Design an enzyme around this catalytic site. Structure first.
Site, PDB file in Angstrom:
ATOM      1  CB  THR A   1      -1.022   0.007   1.240  1.00 25.26           C
ATOM      2  OG1 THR A   1      -1.648  -1.223   1.324  1.00 25.26           O
ATOM      3  CG2 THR A   1      -2.014   1.145   0.893  1.00 25.26           C
TER       4      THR A   1
ATOM      5  CE  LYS B   1      -6.075  -0.847   0.240  1.00 25.11           C
ATOM      6  NZ  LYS B   1      -5.721  -1.545   1.688  1.00 25.11           N
TER       7      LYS B   1
ATOM      8  CE  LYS C   1      -4.796   2.075   3.330  1.00 23.30           C
ATOM      9  NZ  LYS C   1      -4.627   2.169   4.883  1.00 23.30           N
TER      10      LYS C   1
ATOM     11  CG  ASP D   1      -9.830   1.110   0.254  1.00 26.34           C
ATOM     12  OD1 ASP D   1     -10.965   1.840   0.379  1.00 26.34           O
ATOM     13  OD2 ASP D   1      -9.584   0.048   0.814  1.00 26.34           O
TER      14      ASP D   1
ATOM     15  CG  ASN E   1     -10.304   3.594   2.958  1.00 27.38           C
ATOM     16  OD1 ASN E   1      -9.341   3.722   2.202  1.00 27.38           O
ATOM     17  ND2 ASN E   1     -10.453   2.559   3.826  1.00 27.38           N
TER      18      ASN E   1
ATOM     19  CD  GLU F   1     -10.908  -2.146  -0.736  1.00 25.22           C
ATOM     20  OE1 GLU F   1      -9.792  -2.493  -1.192  1.00 25.22           O
ATOM     21  OE2 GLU F   1     -10.914  -2.068   0.484  1.00 25.22           O
TER      22      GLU F   1
ATOM     23  CG  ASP G   1     -13.178  -3.266   2.692  1.00 27.57           C
ATOM     24  OD1 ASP G   1     -13.638  -4.016   3.653  1.00 27.57           O
ATOM     25  OD2 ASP G   1     -12.167  -2.763   2.913  1.00 27.57           O
TER      26      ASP G   1
ATOM     27  CB  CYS H   1      -5.178  -7.912   6.204  1.00 33.65           C
ATOM     28  SG  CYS H   1      -4.082  -6.767   5.545  1.00 33.65           S
TER      29      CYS H   1
ATOM     30  CG  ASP I   1      -4.662  -4.908   0.554  1.00 32.82           C
ATOM     31  OD1 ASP I   1      -3.544  -4.376   0.486  1.00 32.82           O
ATOM     32  OD2 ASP I   1      -5.501  -4.329   1.208  1.00 32.82           O
TER      33      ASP I   1
ATOM     34  CG  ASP J   1      -0.185  -3.948   2.550  1.00 34.16           C
ATOM     35  OD1 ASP J   1      -1.266  -4.429   3.324  1.00 34.16           O
ATOM     36  OD2 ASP J   1      -0.075  -2.984   2.077  1.00 34.16           O
TER      37      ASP J   1
END
Ligand SMILES: [Mg+2]
Ligand SMILES: [Mg+2]
Ligand SMILES: [Mg+2]
Ligand SMILES: [Mg+2]
Ligand SMILES: [Mg+2]
Ligand SMILES: [Mg+2]
Lengths: 330, 333, 331, 330, 338, 332
Positions: free
Chosen positions: C122, C147, C149, C176, C178, C204, C229, C280, C305, C307
């Site tokens: 990430t 990935k 963010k 992602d 979020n 995501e 997610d 995770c 994903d 990590d």
């Protein structure tokens, strides 16, 4: 307990707005105030009609204690044909109650925020006068500009572009006031979009009854679509939510009153709907109603409360602090 | 502004099987005013455990300390983050209004609307032997209760028999049936039909199917002659918006222990904007805990029925609610 | 039969602190199975102190049950829906213990579909300069799935993606957001990145968890596959997403679903055209081991994903798997 | 690793069932066994066809380690035209696997239950003969009786009433085997219901392609409705769920194989669906497949595994214990 | 009346291995069907089974001769509807179902002194078939397309689905050397919904037109077909997702596709006729394809297409990828009734 | 190849409370002549027999010169006569009548030859409950075991009529056609009332107005008896809509509404959607009913057959190419 209720015609000159002010007096001597700024186009109201039912209004709530304001709210919901009056009486009730409670209306409503920011409106005029007004507004510190359109697609597109040129750094709220067909409403959005211009809220581009049209525009528009005239009551909003028609609902106390306004907030925050709050032709004392509502609930992304800034008032009559495009409590 | 927040474990003994372990919330303001709330957790409904609530005391203290209660909406938003501890979310939010109302010189009910001055609660007839069930019923009816909640869901044939027998000895009373997610869709409908043919009327038929079975609630609603309510299926304002969109139920049984004050207020508005009827229930609150619902119910005046008897099932030397309990009725002084 | 279950706080320090709860299951045979709960306040509403507080209840719930009847342990632990990460920890520890008594490994018990998987790494939220730096380093370490963010600033996020793409040619990207974007913002982001000629493998959860219609709206307009997610925690959530045709992907996290719901989500996905990726929270090597075996055994994921353990400082590796660069295999 | 696999025609005289037994041999010497009981009417299979593809089956999985059973499952999913063989090879794979693991299939699958109870079937015959099978079955200890109907609504209703009278205390499962129209199917349930009789599971009253019919019957039926012929694969079940067509799904390994069966259990438990498990014409060795599946998963409310009880075998070949209507592991 | 039915295995080698998404073939093992009537007349059909699409295996088709024989021996072909109803039970052997049903009409038309196409309506006298470009390196695909174009084919079917990047490239290169030709693209379920939409958008952006975009996603993904249909500027077809008349009724109810590619090897004559009526009653367009039929087998589809005249496009080139044994005239890319 | 097509008015006198049909004769160069009959309906199809006759020349010019072996071409062209469905039916059948002759066979066989025999019901028109029971008893005596009962003008008396008919015809099945006379509520009450009297109705035909598809669906849901669409099912497009809306259990096909063209389509649509079928008629004489008999025999797609119009008329000489044996029809 309420001992008397009074309605008074109050006229304000622009730069005329005929409103009806409501005064409620309690046994304790405390006095609460509200202001109804009617709309014939939106609510089908006429100021002379509001004045004619003063005695009925008085009779509906006299003798009720403001601590049982929910009873006053239910009773005044019966004035669905006089929404602006509903708004005024309900707010005056809270204004009176908050005084007997030793606090302010905004805190009674939750005191979520201490400050909010209003936009200022660029009305329909020649592209020249429009841009000139936009510059003036931008100069005074306004960073959210409301642009009225709806009667000339091609000219409206040009006007927004010209306004964007001289106000870089500001956000835009475009209100088409039901002037476009579905396809025209979509074309307006796309054209503006292709010019690299972003619209924070694209307000009611189609007819008030055309809920499927709103949905259609919401789907193709790259900008968030709002319902204004289609969102008058909590029931209208539940329908909008069920039909997944809009991204935003523009709340106006003059359309919904306090009771429905509070329901619309809860419904919106329970369904991914964004909110903005507007006004009709309220003077400072009337805009005060919306300021406290927006500050206490803190539910709005944008505030279009500039009507008092378009009127001439000997003295400020709101129970809040106006500082440039910003409003706070003291 | 809040200067201190305290969580305390408090046990209450029942009368018939056993114990209720709640977490009491005390908030203290610089003014010296103190507000109180009570969290009555539910493992089955909310997934909570009392030991878990007690363990996050410092976190809660940290979340709201320093905030003025006149900005209660800020406290409400912060505490909504405690969606994993809804019973505690409720206790903190109400504790906040309890404190605020004192500083404003009023009571929580008036702050919430002062819609009503009195409400009436039902009494519960737990699952037992038909004979014992009828015994409870007669005693309850005898005590003056005219709304009787009957628990069912384990044995369809017997549940039907129990209701019939309870009806015979309580003529004049209204009935609320809570199957607590024990029936399948077909059994739930059969239960409704059987009772109906016996000429018995059920005011509210509560959560007959599993909580995730929204389609089942809607199925039962369609065939049932009695109003069907969502309880376990309605914990948040989002659960209720979904029930409304799916046209799944006639009622929503609101519990502050599931929704907290924030979501509860939201549910009331949603319901009154969608033709939904409401009732308010409880978990295992003591007198101080039921107080939270009493003020909510009186203030909003949004409920047709009130199932607030948890405190009447427990043992308490001294009454600790800020309201008057007169037989099945409750009012404020 | 289980003779003891122990929960213990485990603190791990980040490179630039993750507090988990390790679960140890002790069998009468002497075998010990291990799991790890990496709680999430934001996603699951969990707090680490609360997990530790129910140790007795958890031990009481399954002590005495023979691990060969693991389905009973799974059903009982599904009651910990308010403590999903612990649900996951206990369930995997049960499988870790069971597989040892069976003379095999968890991954094989779950199908042994694949022998190797690859995880992304990430690039967190930071200034564009720092973001590009993380990316270059990650890329140099051999990671070919990265990935990114985003979610707090649309304009900057589009910019960040383009810059990261410029210095990592050859890599695939998972973005992602979020839950940070509105539906319109989520659509604009995908369109802007698309117009830049950049491809996103998985976009995501761009909108709030309750906004299922939003996910579907983005799914319709987005040229990139859209994933749920936060909106996908339980098997019931996934069935709802499937019925609503809301997404292209579901990002499964054992910390959200536990093993039981995760197995259900895999079957629901392969029965409905839904693709999967596994993620995770803040698991250490012993915790990520849970997901590595699940991914290897089921072989259900297009992307991995996992990590979290690479960001933590660990004296010694404690995973029952082999970490070889961005790749993970079983020994 | 699999070193060889072979198919063998096995015929069983009734009191004829032609099945195909699958034997898988591993390099360690362990041997796994499965049985395919084909259905022309349900799966379109012919026992001669299953036998003819033996070589293809061997080449598909030979060399694969059973510890990578998910790979074998995916490869055998390609045999969707020979589902019964798919089930046999997949179970044979688990049978061998569990042995190398020193345990049993039911435990490999979860070991949720230690005992299950199967019903016994009352076939189509004169009303008088049906009542006799029923009494005989009840006498044998069975308390769940499956009654086949579908050729004569009128007699089917009478048969059910008569069977009920002589088997008081038993639960009933009625399988119409797609013989009724939607309206006849509803009438059947209503008629039976008016006689005070309860049916625990009303199985596939209409044609397999008529999903809407199943939903229609489901809506009007006071008894739970199950899809059998309509539910062969996990994809059929996902469709049934999206359409909200049934209350139950009757899983048969001979329709779904082990892979899809596992998927259907998960889908069902995630959608409020109830499950029952049935069979075709398996001998004791084949019913063993469903017994372990039902004990391990523990996913079924009802078990209709009596085919091996309709056949004659000098030597019981199941890896379970048959104790009256009950089955357990040793 | 049918007095005998005989199955036989005949093998045909392709000119070159045929590669499609997740599949390569260089041989076609078909089951020919011979029906003999009490009148002495003999009708012929051919089953070209498919493991991937129908789950069939040639050895299994051969093993059920006695069952087929038992189903229809003794029935008069003039009562062909009974034979059709009975053979619909061979839903697990659709290719054999097709062969037997056609053999039946072949025998019947001889006794009536006419041809099958006429028995079906005799709507058209001529049909044109495309030619297929299998998967290979981009260079080979263009070369193959080039060759096909010069042979006179003006409808070119291009296989794709294994590599989006290269498929877009191959399609662009093929269009450059085949101007004037129409294109049918078949992804054989190789793409995800997003990939399928991107493929169409990229080709569209290059100014290339695709007359039929065939089965871009998995067979069970009906909603996916609909998703692609909505964004694709080109007509989308169901092939693997359309095997029975029930599959098609479902596709119509869900408004999933613009086209259905009918293959007698998937539906048989009975379901194929039903599919034509369903399509023409719902605004659905049709194309007719094939598996690995030799000339005698393709004859079955030629007569079907000529008689019903229900198809916009014809992908009947399996016998060209492999002496003439059909009962029609092959004229370059054109097929005509004799 | 067709060399001529001629239409001619044919009047047939009914027995009890005339049918004016248009007979179609197609002439082939080979000398073969194919026949069909158009029994128009003003109420259902909006047709008028005088209008049908007036377009004879247009019909002839449309298909003259086409070989009947290319009948699908003739079907496509004649589909343009959607404003004259009865004529469309007659021309399409006459074409197949001529073709089967040149091929040395019969129309039923050309359509599949699925069945060798079919059974028709007989109709009890609306009259006094007394004459109602009178007709029924007579019909039952003639051997008919499927009786069609007309209703729709008076709910109470209709329910009464059915109960009385049921009592004097034990053993017979009933088909009730309300001919669009009931409201949704009335339509449901009729079915419930009859049901409560322990009487079974095999097919409950078009209870509500033709465009009220939602109504049909509502009655379908509450009616314990199968609901059929008649007036709402004229074209194959109408049926696809009924199927998509899940509005009915049955479709009552009439060649006079659909022609052979759409009829074949409706059959395939039905068998591909769990829809059951029945076949009816307008006022066809024996030559006209012949068309539906061959269709029913050949396709074998119908659960029930309502082909009695020729039994209600007066013909000295039978003119159908089939065998009328009591309530049964077979071909030779
Ligand atoms: Mg506006
Ligand atoms: Mg409850
Ligand atoms: Mg995420
Ligand atoms: Mg069955
Ligand atoms: Mg294809
Ligand atoms: Mg009719």
């Amino acid at each position: 307990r309420i001992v008397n209720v009074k309605l008074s015609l109050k006229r304000y000159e622009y730069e005329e707005s005929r409103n009806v002010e409501v005064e409620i007096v309690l046994e304790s001597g405390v006095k609460g105030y509200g202001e109804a700024s009617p709309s014939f186009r939106v609510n089908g109201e006429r100021v002379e009609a509001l004045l004619a039912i003063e005695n009925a209004v008085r009779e509906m709530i006299t003798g009720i204690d403001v601590r049982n304001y929910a009873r006053i709210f239910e009773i005044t919901d019966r004035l669905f044909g006089f929404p602006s009056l509903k708004a005024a009486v309900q707010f005056a009730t809270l204004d009176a109650l908050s005084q007997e409670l030793g606090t302010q209306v905004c805190y009674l409503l939750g005191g979520k925020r201490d400050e909010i920011e209003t936009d200022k409106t660029v009305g329909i005029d020649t592209v020249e006068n429009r841009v000139k007004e936009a510059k003036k507004i931008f100069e005074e510190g306004f960073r959210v500009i409301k642009i009225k359109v709806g009667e000339n697609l091609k000219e409206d597109i040009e006007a927004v572009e010209e306004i964007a040129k001289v106000t870089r750094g500001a956000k835009y709220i475009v209100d088409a006031n039901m002037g476009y067909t579905q396809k025209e409403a979509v074309e307006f959005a796309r054209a503006v979009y292709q010019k690299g211009i972003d619209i924070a809220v694209y307000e009611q581009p189609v007819r008030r009854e055309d809920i499927e049209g709103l949905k259609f525009v919401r789907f193709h528009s790259p900008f968030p679509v709002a319902a204004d005239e289609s969102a008058r009551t909590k029931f209208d909003v539940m329908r909008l939510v069920k039909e997944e028609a809009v991204d935003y609902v523009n709340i106006k106390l003059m359309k919904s009153g306090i009771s429905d306004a509070l329901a619309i907030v809860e419904i919106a925050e329970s369904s991914g709907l964004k909110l903005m709050i507007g006004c009709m032709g309220e003077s400072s004392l009337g805009i005060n109603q919306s300021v406290h509502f927006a500050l206490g609930t803190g539910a709005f992304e944008f505030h279009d409360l500039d009507s008092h800034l378009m009127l001439k008032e000997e003295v400020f009559r709101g129970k809040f602090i106006q500082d440039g495009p910003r409003m706070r409590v003291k």
